[PDB]
Design an enzyme around this catalytic site. Structure first.
Site, PDB file in Angstrom:
ATOM      1  N   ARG A 188      -0.214   9.139   1.072  1.00  0.00           N
ATOM      2  CA  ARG A 188      -1.016   9.152   2.309  1.00  0.00           C
ATOM      3  C   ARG A 188      -0.323   8.305   3.373  1.00  0.00           C
ATOM      4  O   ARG A 188      -0.598   8.493   4.534  1.00  0.00           O
ATOM      5  CB  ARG A 188      -2.425   8.656   2.005  1.00  0.00           C
ATOM      6  N   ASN A 189       0.537   7.384   2.972  1.00  0.00           N
ATOM      7  CA  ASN A 189       1.188   6.398   3.857  1.00  0.00           C
ATOM      8  C   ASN A 189       2.619   6.822   4.174  1.00  0.00           C
ATOM      9  O   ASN A 189       3.425   5.977   4.619  1.00  0.00           O
ATOM     10  CB  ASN A 189       1.132   5.047   3.173  1.00  0.00           C
ATOM     11  N   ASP A 216       0.840  -1.237   0.000  1.00  0.00           N
ATOM     12  CA  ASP A 216       0.000   0.000   0.000  1.00  0.00           C
ATOM     13  C   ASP A 216       0.858   1.264   0.000  1.00  0.00           C
ATOM     14  O   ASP A 216       0.453   2.242   0.631  1.00  0.00           O
ATOM     15  CB  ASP A 216      -1.008   0.081   1.147  1.00  0.00           C
ATOM     16  N   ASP A 219       2.610   2.755   7.208  1.00  0.00           N
ATOM     17  CA  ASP A 219       1.407   2.052   6.716  1.00  0.00           C
ATOM     18  C   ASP A 219       0.305   2.323   7.723  1.00  0.00           C
ATOM     19  O   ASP A 219       0.389   1.779   8.781  1.00  0.00           O
ATOM     20  CB  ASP A 219       1.628   0.546   6.547  1.00  0.00           C
TER      21      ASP A 219
HETATM   22  C1  OQM Z   1      -0.253   2.900  12.294  1.00  0.00           C
HETATM   23  C2  OQM Z   1       0.650   4.076  12.442  1.00  0.00           C
HETATM   24  N1  OQM Z   1       0.045   5.243  12.521  1.00  0.00           N
HETATM   25  C3  OQM Z   1       0.822   6.321  12.664  1.00  0.00           C
HETATM   26  N2  OQM Z   1       0.489   7.600  12.743  1.00  0.00           N
HETATM   27  C4  OQM Z   1       1.672   8.279  12.853  1.00  0.00           C
HETATM   28  C5  OQM Z   1       1.788   9.740  12.985  1.00  0.00           C
HETATM   29  C6  OQM Z   1       0.699  10.568  12.770  1.00  0.00           C
HETATM   30  C7  OQM Z   1       0.866  11.914  12.865  1.00  0.00           C
HETATM   31  C8  OQM Z   1       2.099  12.410  13.193  1.00  0.00           C
HETATM   32  N3  OQM Z   1       3.160  11.640  13.444  1.00  0.00           N
HETATM   33  C9  OQM Z   1       2.994  10.330  13.336  1.00  0.00           C
HETATM   34  N4  OQM Z   1       2.730   7.475  12.847  1.00  0.00           N
HETATM   35  N5  OQM Z   1       2.185   6.234  12.733  1.00  0.00           N
HETATM   36  C10 OQM Z   1       2.820   5.052  12.678  1.00  0.00           C
HETATM   37  C11 OQM Z   1       4.302   5.051  12.743  1.00  0.00           C
HETATM   38  C12 OQM Z   1       2.012   3.931  12.526  1.00  0.00           C
HETATM   39  C13 OQM Z   1       2.625   2.569  12.418  1.00  0.00           C
HETATM   40  C14 OQM Z   1       2.873   2.189  10.983  1.00  0.00           C
HETATM   41  O1  OQM Z   1       3.095   3.027  10.121  1.00  0.00           O
HETATM   42  N6  OQM Z   1       2.813   0.859  10.774  1.00  0.00           N
HETATM   43  C15 OQM Z   1       3.450   0.102   9.761  1.00  0.00           C
HETATM   44  C16 OQM Z   1       2.976  -1.190   9.593  1.00  0.00           C
HETATM   45  C17 OQM Z   1       3.498  -1.997   8.625  1.00  0.00           C
HETATM   46  C18 OQM Z   1       4.506  -1.549   7.803  1.00  0.00           C
HETATM   47  C19 OQM Z   1       4.979  -0.264   7.963  1.00  0.00           C
HETATM   48  C20 OQM Z   1       6.049   0.214   7.052  1.00  0.00           C
HETATM   49  F1  OQM Z   1       6.670  -0.806   6.524  1.00  0.00           F
HETATM   50  F2  OQM Z   1       5.589   0.963   6.046  1.00  0.00           F
HETATM   51  F3  OQM Z   1       6.979   0.941   7.636  1.00  0.00           F
HETATM   52  C21 OQM Z   1       4.459   0.572   8.941  1.00  0.00           C
END
Ligand code: OQM
Length: 288
Positions: free
Chosen positions: A147-148, A143, A161
């Site tokens: 936005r991600n 994905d 993500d």
């Molecule tokens: C779910 C989530 N939501 C978030 N909101 C925020 C955020 C929002 C506003 C300001 N500052 C930070 N940070 N933030 C993170 C790190 C995650 C975890 C995630 O991104 N998870 C994830 C899961 C699987 C894979 C990956 C990756 F591979 F893309 F890194 C990330």
């Protein structure tokens, strides 16, 4: 479970930033987390609800991923519900909102008005560098879209993500059967037809992110319904060069959109091409 744990008392929630189906995100003060900073701001995801397995699993992965251009994971608060994941707070929110808010249609780290080529390339460059790190770990994202990605102070762009993504950008997904959501506008024909996801489907998605970046967050195929776009992508029809996009960059995009996965450029190549450009002098860029 080799995950840094954080005491609940060290976390003080300030207010909510965003909601998802699997949790809410708060800004919080966190204490005695970094030694340089006895206090400091983070973002905290409370788990909402099978769901606790997911959280444990996400946490383990977020600890393992470590890179200047992948979101930064501080650890968990398991002691007493709700369960909390703690992350780095990215001041400028998601790259989409950021791109839309500094494009023609609409401070401290950015000049007024349209981002210029140089800035646009530095962004694309950072997202490319992240995608090197995951292809390195043979990690298929599935994905990848602006936005991600989050933007921090200094225009540090990081890939994550989010589930806030499936809720704030309902329109970027196609809901199929009960509960499944497909970011079909960002997917290659092999992902859509055969339902096969790989590094090669990730670099396709990177090219679409490139198009997002130079269109200042327009949705790919915005002029289409979800079924019109599926027709369009399977039938081989490529997105147009955006106005702000030099032909040399549309070239890096095109290499991501080769029909045959194998024929698509490696992400190390794409990165190389974009970092080259991001760090070329104004005299070289000013005539691109
Ligand atoms: C779910 C989530 N939501 C978030 N909101 C925020 C955020 C929002 C506003 C300001 N500052 C930070 N940070 N933030 C993170 C790190 C995650 C975890 C995630 O991104 N998870 C994830 C899961 C699987 C894979 C990956 C990756 F591979 F893309 F890194 C990330």
């Amino acid at each position: 479970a080799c995950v840094h744990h954080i005491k609940r008392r060290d976390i003080v929630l300030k207010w909510e930033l965003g909601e998802g189906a699997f949790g809410k995100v708060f800004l919080a003060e966190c204490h005695n987390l970094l030694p340089e900073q006895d206090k400091m701001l983070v973002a905290v995801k409370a788990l909402k609800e099978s769901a606790r397995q997911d959280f444990q699993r996400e946490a383990e992965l977020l600890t393992m991923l470590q890179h200047q251009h992948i979101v930064r994971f501080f650890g968990v608060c398991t002691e007493g519900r709700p369960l909390l994941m703690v992350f780095e707070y990215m001041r400028h929110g998601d790259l989409n909102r950021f791109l839309r808010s500094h494009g023609p249609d609409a401070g401290e780290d950015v000049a007024p008005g349209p981002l210029g080529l140089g800035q646009l390339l530095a962004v694309a460059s950072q997202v490319a560098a992240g995608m090197v790190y995951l292809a390195g770990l043979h990690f298929v994202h599935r994905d990848l879209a602006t936005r991600n990605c989050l933007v921090g102070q200094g225009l540090v762009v990081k890939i994550g993500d989010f589930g806030m993504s499936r809720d704030i950008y309902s329109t970027d997904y196609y809901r199929v059967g009960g509960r499944t959501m497909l970011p079909i506008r960002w997917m290659p024909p092999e992902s859509i037809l055969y339902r096969k996801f790989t590094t090669e489907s990730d670099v396709w998605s990177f090219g679409v992110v490139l198009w997002e970046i130079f269109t200042y967050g327009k949705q790919p195929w915005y002029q289409l319904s979800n079924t019109e776009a599926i027709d369009c992508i399977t039938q081989g029809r490529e997105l147009e060069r955006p106005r702000a996009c030099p032909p040399e960059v549309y070239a890096i995009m095109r290499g991501c959109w080769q029909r045959e996965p194998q024929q698509r450029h490696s992400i190390k190549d794409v990165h190389a091409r974009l970092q080259a450009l991001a760090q070329a002098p104004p005299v070289y860029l000013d005539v691109l």
